């Protein structure tokens, strides 16, 4: 009886995250997700119950379609062996913005309501302008109960301080990490609205 990690790698992580300014393919997207017991009446880590997701996994001999992270998740949610006592709060931390409601998001909000006692937090670290959609999709989103925001400086480096162990070495992404912060905050956050139709 002993515990299953995987930790990604360091060189998989920031390339991963490094992409391109734009976007790529609705297809290459890599989610990473974690679980936190609130305890003494604060979050807390839980590498037992912590680990990234991608696109194509596991359940593939079946020869099934589309590949997200996003639902291979809720897929491994039941995984985590939750509770209705307690209360969790997974955290997911996605380099890109999601693809749609009725096709990823819409199924997180279906969980969202199955399983009350735990919350979850999205987190982009691009906006997608190849998919604009994502936007209404996101809008449904947050009503499910979720919440979602931009990356900042610090997250990143919880995530890569977390995820990737390497020396406990700093997270060094590029340069215009927060002028990032700041600009697509404007977008992300004014997205967060969207009204007058
Ligand atoms: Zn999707």
């Given at each position: 009886?002993?515990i299953?990690?995987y930790l990604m790698?360091?060189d998989?992580?920031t390339?991963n995250f490094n992409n391109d300014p734009l976007?790529?393919?609705?297809?290459?997207?890599?989610?990473?997700?974690?679980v936190?017991?609130?305890?003494?009446?604060?979050?807390?880590?839980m590498?037992?119950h912590?680990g990234f997701?991608?696109?194509?996994?596991?359940?593939?001999?079946?020869?099934?379609?589309?590949?997200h992270?996003?639902?291979?998740?809720?897929?491994?949610?039941?995984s985590?062996?939750l509770?209705?006592?307690?209360?969790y709060?997974?955290?997911?931390?996605?380099?890109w913005?999601?693809?749609?409601?009725?096709?990823?998001?819409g199924?997180?909000?279906?969980?969202?309501?199955?399983?009350?006692?735990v919350?979850?937090?999205?987190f982009?670290?691009?906006?997608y302008?190849?998919?604009?959609?994502?936007?209404?999709?996101?809008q449904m989103?947050?009503?499910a109960?979720?919440?979602?925001?931009?990356?900042?400086?610090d997250?990143?480096?919880?995530?890569?301080?977390t995820?990737?162990?390497?020396q406990?070495?700093?997270?060094q992404?590029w340069?215009?990490?927060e002028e990032?912060?700041?600009?697509?905050?404007?977008?992300?956050?004014?997205?967060l609205?969207?009204?007058?139709?």
């Amino acid at each position: 009886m002993e515990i299953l990690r995987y930790l990604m790698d360091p060189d998989t992580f920031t390339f991963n995250f490094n992409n391109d300014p734009l976007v790529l393919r609705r297809r290459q997207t890599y989610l990473c997700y974690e679980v936190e017991r609130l305890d003494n009446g604060t979050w807390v880590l839980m590498d037992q119950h912590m680990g990234f997701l991608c696109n194509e996994a596991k359940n593939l001999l079946c020869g099934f379609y589309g590949r997200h992270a996003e639902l291979r998740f809720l897929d491994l949610v039941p995984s985590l062996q939750l509770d209705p006592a307690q209360i969790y709060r997974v955290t997911w931390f996605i380099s890109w913005s999601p693809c749609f409601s009725w096709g990823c998001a819409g199924e997180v909000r279906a969980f969202l309501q199955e399983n009350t006692h735990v919350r979850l937090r999205i987190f982009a670290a691009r906006i997608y302008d190849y998919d604009p959609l994502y936007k209404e999709a996101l809008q449904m989103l947050r009503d499910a109960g979720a919440q979602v925001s931009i990356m900042t400086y610090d997250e990143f480096e919880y995530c890569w301080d977390t995820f990737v162990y390497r020396q406990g070495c700093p997270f060094q992404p590029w340069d215009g990490l927060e002028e990032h912060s700041q600009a697509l905050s404007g977008r992300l956050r004014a997205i967060l609205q969207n009204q007058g139709n």
